[PDB]
Design a binder for this molecule. Structure first.
Ligand SMILES: [Zn+2]
Ligand SMILES: [Zn+2]
Lengths: 138, 138
């Protein structure tokens, strides 16, 4: 539910992908924590064609939507976790905000449509993986 | 595009239905100017489960969305047109607003989802056919 559905695509955190995701793989990138898989049914979401840097996301741990201001996508060194070794993550946008394990998957939106998806968190920051350059999705 | 798509339903003005609409008929009611037909693909709209009486609709002739205040659904005598004889139309909600032939089909929405669809117009009023009682749709 922590997925973007655009066209015949389902976009998820790569660390959260299901076996069925991999069985219907379209595209994946560890350095971004993104995986896209094929769908049978047409999705309801649109990808934002803008450079907005404020928006609203869904926080899973709080079950609320929050307004947020987030930095332009950058290369960020992200510490080791149970999902990845310490590595450079690209396309990562950071906001001051509540963050708990399980928040990954939460969808970030602006008036133009979907901006990104929660991927990282810690130290009082929420990191969203930007999807706006993925023009092939829409 | 002047259609509501909810579940596997397509909801249209009955006077605008296509032959394919009738070939896949689920439900229709002349007294409301509504027709619902079957779809292959899951729709993106939700029906408003509320009694809101202000909202926004799309005006076809102006190609703009407009904010509107509309009366509670009533039985309204509607004059003869090329589509119906003079008759009582039920479930009809009226707002002061721009209206031209071709505006029928425009979708009215509030924060809870889809409220109604433009059905009538004239004398400085826009009449929307309420769909909120159609709970079987969602
Ligand atoms: Zn935007
Ligand atoms: Zn409402």
């Amino acid at each position: 539910s922590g997925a973007i559905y655009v066209g015949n695509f389902r976009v998820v955190n790569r660390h959260l992908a299901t076996h069925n995701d991999w069985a219907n793989l379209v595209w994946e990138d560890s350095s971004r924590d993104l995986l896209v898989s094929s769908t049978t049914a047409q999705g309801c979401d649109t990808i934002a064609r803008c450079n907005c840097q404020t928006g609203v996301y869904y926080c899973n741990s709080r079950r609320k939507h929050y307004p947020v201001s987030f930095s332009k996508p950058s290369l960020i060194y992200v510490e080791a976790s149970e999902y990845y070794p310490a590595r450079y993550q690209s396309h990562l946008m950071l906001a001051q905000g509540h963050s708990e394990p399980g928040d990954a998957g939460g969808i970030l939106r602006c008036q133009h449509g979907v901006v990104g998806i929660v991927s990282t968190g810690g130290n009082g920051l929420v990191g969203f993986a930007d999807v706006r350059d993925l023009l092939w999705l829409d």
